[PDB]
Structure 1
Amino acid sequence: RPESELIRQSWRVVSRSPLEHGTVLFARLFALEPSLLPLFQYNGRQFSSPEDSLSSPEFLDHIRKVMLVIDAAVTNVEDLSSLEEYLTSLGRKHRAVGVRLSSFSTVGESLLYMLEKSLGPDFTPATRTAWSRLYGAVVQAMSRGWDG
């Protein structure tokens, strides 16, 4: 497929420096939906401001975890049925920590922002569409962790 190749080629640029790029993703996320900030409770404590999260080793480890899941999806773009059970369970975990399913649309927009800003003119409307489709498929699998 041509979509699969657009995804693999664009990801190569981002996966070079996953923490730097995942930092952009989460900075954008908290700018759009500040109410996600209290859901990261490490040591029973809440971050006051978004910049507090960037000093937290546990938060930065979660950025790495995110980028690893996306890497797995890109690696398996031709057949995502293999990640399906893992993703359902990842959904259940996030439901448990208190993330609402509607917040994953904001995460998607933040991912697209991070890609747009990293790729500049190489972020074509075809590339956007491809990533939207891939992210949609990931979220569909995760959404089974909220039942359905």
Structure 2
Amino acid sequence: PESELIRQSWRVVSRSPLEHGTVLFARLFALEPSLLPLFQYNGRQFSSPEDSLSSPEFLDHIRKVMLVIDAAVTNVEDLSSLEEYLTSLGRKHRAVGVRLSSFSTVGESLLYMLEKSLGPDFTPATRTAWSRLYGAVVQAMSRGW
């Protein structure tokens, strides 16, 4: 039942992944501005959250995130088939200054974006399913630490 909730809710999001991931990252930086400095291109720091929105490379980073979530949605019944990628993804993260405790804020910004996108269709069952999927994803990436 849960996998079908995940695939049905994702369907709307995946049609316009940059618009939706823009919402996730805007929210992430409103909640935790101290993450902003981790996204550096040409050795420069964004001053404000809206600076990140004007950067091709940052907008490219978002498309890559939404592609990886999409991979997790396509493989929701068996993530074992994705676990090796995520563990390496995790490693890339720990190496670039990312803290494990930052994962909860990222998950809440994902849930926020899904809830804002889905509206009445974001039933507690959908919230719970996504929170379980995100938790499995974070488990795998935590190995890389």
Q: Shorter-normalised TM-score: what interval?
A: over 0.9
How far is the alpha carbon of 1:25 from its aligned partner?
A: 0.1
**Cα-to-partner distance string for 1:73-97 (whole Å, 9 max, x where unaligned):** 0000000001111101101101111
> TM-score, normalization: structure 1?
0.97
**Cα-to-partner distance string for 1:81-138 (whole Å, 9 max, x where unaligned):** 0111110110110111111011011000000000000000000000000000000000
How far is the alpha carbon of 1:49 from its aligned partner?
A: 0.4
Q: Does 1:3 pair with 2:2?
A: yes
| Structure 2 gap segments, 5+ residues each | none
Give me the whole-angstrom Cα distance separating, in 1, the residues matched to 2:83 and 2:3: 18
Structure 2 match to 1:86? 85
Moved over 4 A (4+): none
Give me the whole-angstrom Cα distance separating, in 2, the residues matched to 1:88 and 1:39: 20
- The 5 A counterparts of 1:1-148 are 2-146=1-145
What number of residue pairs does the alignment pair up? 145
How far is the alpha carbon of 1:69 from its aligned partner?
A: 0.2
How far is the alpha carbon of 1:5 from its aligned partner?
A: 0.2
Give me the whole-angstrom Cα distance separating, in 1, the residues matched to 2:50 and 2:93: 22
Give me the whole-angstrom Cα distance separating, in 2, the residues matched to 1:11 and 1:80: 16
Identity %: 100
| Structure 1 gap segments, 5+ residues each | none
**Cα-to-partner distance string for 1:11-30 (whole Å, 9 max, x where unaligned):** 00111100000000000000
**Cα-to-partner distance string for 1:13-67 (whole Å, 9 max, x where unaligned):** 1111000000000000000011000000111110000000001000000000000
